[PDB]
Amino acid sequence: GSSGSSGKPYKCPQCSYASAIKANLNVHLRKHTGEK
Protein backbone atom coordinates (compact mmCIF):
# COMPACT_ATOMS: atom_id res chain seq x y z
CA GLY A 1 0.00 0.00 0.00
CA SER A 2 1.84 3.05 -1.31
CA SER A 3 2.08 5.36 1.70
CA GLY A 4 4.61 7.49 3.55
CA SER A 5 7.91 8.83 2.23
CA SER A 6 11.03 6.83 3.10
CA GLY A 7 14.51 8.33 2.94
CA LYS A 8 15.50 10.80 5.64
CA PRO A 9 16.38 9.40 9.09
CA TYR A 10 14.36 11.92 11.09
CA LYS A 11 10.66 11.08 10.86
CA CYS A 12 7.61 12.90 12.24
CA PRO A 13 5.75 11.15 15.09
CA GLN A 14 2.51 12.51 13.63
CA CYS A 15 2.69 12.44 9.83
CA SER A 16 5.00 10.74 7.35
CA TYR A 17 7.18 13.86 7.31
CA ALA A 18 10.88 13.03 7.07
CA SER A 19 13.86 15.40 7.08
CA ALA A 20 17.64 15.02 6.89
CA ILE A 21 18.15 17.68 9.57
CA LYS A 22 16.76 17.40 13.10
CA ALA A 23 16.18 21.12 13.66
CA ASN A 24 14.05 21.01 10.51
CA LEU A 25 11.69 18.47 12.08
CA ASN A 26 11.52 20.46 15.32
CA VAL A 27 9.97 23.41 13.49
CA HIS A 28 7.71 21.08 11.51
CA LEU A 29 6.07 20.00 14.76
CA ARG A 30 5.59 23.59 15.94
CA LYS A 31 2.71 23.47 13.46
CA HIS A 32 1.39 20.02 14.40
CA THR A 33 0.90 21.10 18.01
CA GLY A 34 -1.16 24.09 16.91
CA GLU A 35 -4.47 24.69 15.16
CA LYS A 36 -7.41 27.09 14.94
Binding-site residue numbers for Zn(2+) are 12, 15, 28, 32
Distance CA 22, CA 5 (A): 16
Q: For the chain, what is the total number of helices (H) and then of strands (E)?
A: 1, 2
CB of 9 to Zn ion, least distance (A): 15
Q: Which of residues 4-33 bind Zn ion (CB under 5 A)?
A: 12, 14-15, 17
Report, in Å, the least distance between residue 36 CB and Zn ion: 17
**Dist. CA 13–CA 28, nearest whole Å:** 11
Residue ranges that bind Zn ion, judged by CB under 5 A: 12, 14-15, 17
